[PDB]
């Protein structure tokens, strides 16, 4: 049985009666200047009209197609420094024995990275597939790449994560990667990936790449817009 001496005392938080309870005031925090600046920078880029050469970068690969590409790319990740050092030591042992470097070593197959290198490969038409990072800052380093790939006939895709590409190439950040040539057993997988990239990405973005971006308003301004549209429809 409950103690009779325990009673409930409700607190009425109306205007001018009780001290207001501690609520979540995260929406109204006076943030530091760098946080405020990055938020308003994103907002300003949303509000202004974005020309098509930049607004084409909003459309990226979906999750399934990105994972399907990375399944091929992780087989062709480049050598790390330790693996390279081990390869040099094993080849040095064979040369110490007198055997040939052609005999002990074989043609490597890796994902090609580096911006100037990848651009050169695209111009020389050695690139089979080109993946361009979403968030390169400054954007002028990559803003010509889709048009260059369309000119050269190389299939391409814009993919989320320069950090994701840097993790492939054992760096912090890669702006662009290219597959040029694969081993014999992965040729079918590469062809299937290229066809899937074409049908999923390029056919979808052919209409929307020429359109201007931006023009999106804020939440309150949008709600005012549907309120005035509803009033106009009622009138």
């Amino acid at each position: 049985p409950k103690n009779p001496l325990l009673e409930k005392r409700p607190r009425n938080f109306g205007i001018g009666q009780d001290i207001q309870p501690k609520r979540n005031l995260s929406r109204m925090v006076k943030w530091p200047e760098y946080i405020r600046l990055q938020r308003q920078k994103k907002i300003l880029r949303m509000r202004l009209k974005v020309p098509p050469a930049i607004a084409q970068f909003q459309y990226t690969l979906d999750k399934n197609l990105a994972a399907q590409a990375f399944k091929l790319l992780n087989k062709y990740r480049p050598e790390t420094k330790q693996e390279k050092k081990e390869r040099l030591l094993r080849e040095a042992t064979a040369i110490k024995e007198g055997k040939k470097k052609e005999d002990v070593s074989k043609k490597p197959y890796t994902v090609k990275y580096g911006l100037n290198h990848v651009v050169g490969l695209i111009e020389n038409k050695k690139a089979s597939l080109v993946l361009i990072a979403n968030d390169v800052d400054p954007i002028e380093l990559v803003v010509f790449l889709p048009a260059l790939c369309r000119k050269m006939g190389i299939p391409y895709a814009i993919i989320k994560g320069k950090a994701r590409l840097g993790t492939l190439v054992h760096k912090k950040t890669a702006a662009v990667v290219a597959i040029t040539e694969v081993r014999s057993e992965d040729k079918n997988e590469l062809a299937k990936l290229i066809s899937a990239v074409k049908e999923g990405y390029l056919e979808k973005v052919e209409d929307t790449r020429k359109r201007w971006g931006g023009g999106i308003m804020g939440f309150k301004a949008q709600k005012r817009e549907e309120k005035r549209k509803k009033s106009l429809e009622t009138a």
Binding site: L25, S26, V29
Partner: peptide, 18 residues
């Protein structure tokens, strides 16, 4: 993407290892 509950509108510099 849940964020911290902030019961104050004041942001303080986080204390770090010295």
């Amino acid at each position: 993407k849940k964020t911290k509950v902030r019961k104050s509108t004041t942001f303080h510099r986080p204390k770090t290892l010295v």
